[PDB]
Design a binder for this molecule. Structure first.
Ligand SMILES: [Cu+2]
Length: 293
DNA sequence: GCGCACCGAAAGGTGCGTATTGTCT
């Protein structure tokens, strides 16, 4: 699954949650939850773990190396864009196999699927440039990306996902950093989701897993049935309950109704004990009759 | 954007809209 969200100033705070380890076990320097990506990042001398400080600066539009603040051309009657959030979420069974049964290779599989997809999003990175009143679009091919891997849903179910925060910046041929023209990436969301799916599936098959493709075109490991997946999909059940209570048909709901059911069905965000949580996951798995073999 | 209206100052730049699967900020 791939979802995108354009980030404006009012979401800059949410750029903090990316660090508040939505992840846990592997967040502890185990392959480290965060990582920079992109030719643009390399252009700014950035690799490895993402720095909370530097990231906050780039979100604000500050390169720092002797440059002026970016996006000053933003109309004051409009929202300053600080980035584009591309969230990759693995199939449930996959999350189970990696987080419950514990299989770091799945985590690597997911990270590769994500990294290869971002390389494709990068090839769609564009900027604008005007000359004598004539505007032109320029495929810059470079992006600065902060990737944050997390492991749980709002209901504390296993939920392997990464937030690929594409910063609103790109370097043109002339060497100037400009806001990102996100048309291409935004309109390529569905396609990029398939690239993720394909890359993930490939990586999973190389580890030896058998995949079961459903109608959608999505998949889940073969040794885990639907009922078992639903037992670790509480948010899904909450959303379905909302539609039921509203007498709505999930097979045809306006965006307003869909977003209303996602947001309004959310419960109170309480902390947990990562150690105890996993033991719960395992106990639950057994009850559901899951064989992580 | 389906080109405009603003921003700042560079015969320059930016938002805007875009998006619509499920495992579900
Ligand atoms: Cu998350």
């Amino acid at each position: 699954m791939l979802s995108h969200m354009v980030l404006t100033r009012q979401d800059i705070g949410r750029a903090a949650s990316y660090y508040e380890d939505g992840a846990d076990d592997y967040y502890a320097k185990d392959g480290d939850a965060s990582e920079w990506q992109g030719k643009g990042a390399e252009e700014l001398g950035l690799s490895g773990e993402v720095d909370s400080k530097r990231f906050r600066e780039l979100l604000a539009g500050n390169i720092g190396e002797g440059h002026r603040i970016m996006r000053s051309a933003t109309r004051q009657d409009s929202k300053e864009r600080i980035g584009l959030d591309l969230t990759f979420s693995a199939p449930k069974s996959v999350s189970l196999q990696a987080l419950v049964a514990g299989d770091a290779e799945i985590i690597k599989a997911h990270d590769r699927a994500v990294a290869r997809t971002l390389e494709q999003a990068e090839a769609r990175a564009q900027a604008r440039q005007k000359i004598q009143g004539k505007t032109r679009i320029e495929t810059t091919g470079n992006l600065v990306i902060g990737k944050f891997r997390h492991e749980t849903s709002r209901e504390r179910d296993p939920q392997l996902h990464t937030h690929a925060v594409i910063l609103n910046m790109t370097k043109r041929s002339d060497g100037q950093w400009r806001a990102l023209k996100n048309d291409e990436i935004v309109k390529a969301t569905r396609y990029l989701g398939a690239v993720y799916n394909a890359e993930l599936a490939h990586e999973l098959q190389k580890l030896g897993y058998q995949l079961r493709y459903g109608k959608d075109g999505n998949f889940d490991l073969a040794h885990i049935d639907r009922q078992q997946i639903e037992g670790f999909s509480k948010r899904t059940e909450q959303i379905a309950e909302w539609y039921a209570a509203r007498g709505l048909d999930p097979n045809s709901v306006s965006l307003e109704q869909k977003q209303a059911a996602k947001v309004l069905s959310r419960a109170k965000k309480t902390s947990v004990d990562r150690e105890a949580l996993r033991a719960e996951w395992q106990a639950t798995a057994k009850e559901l009759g899951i064989d992580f073999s």
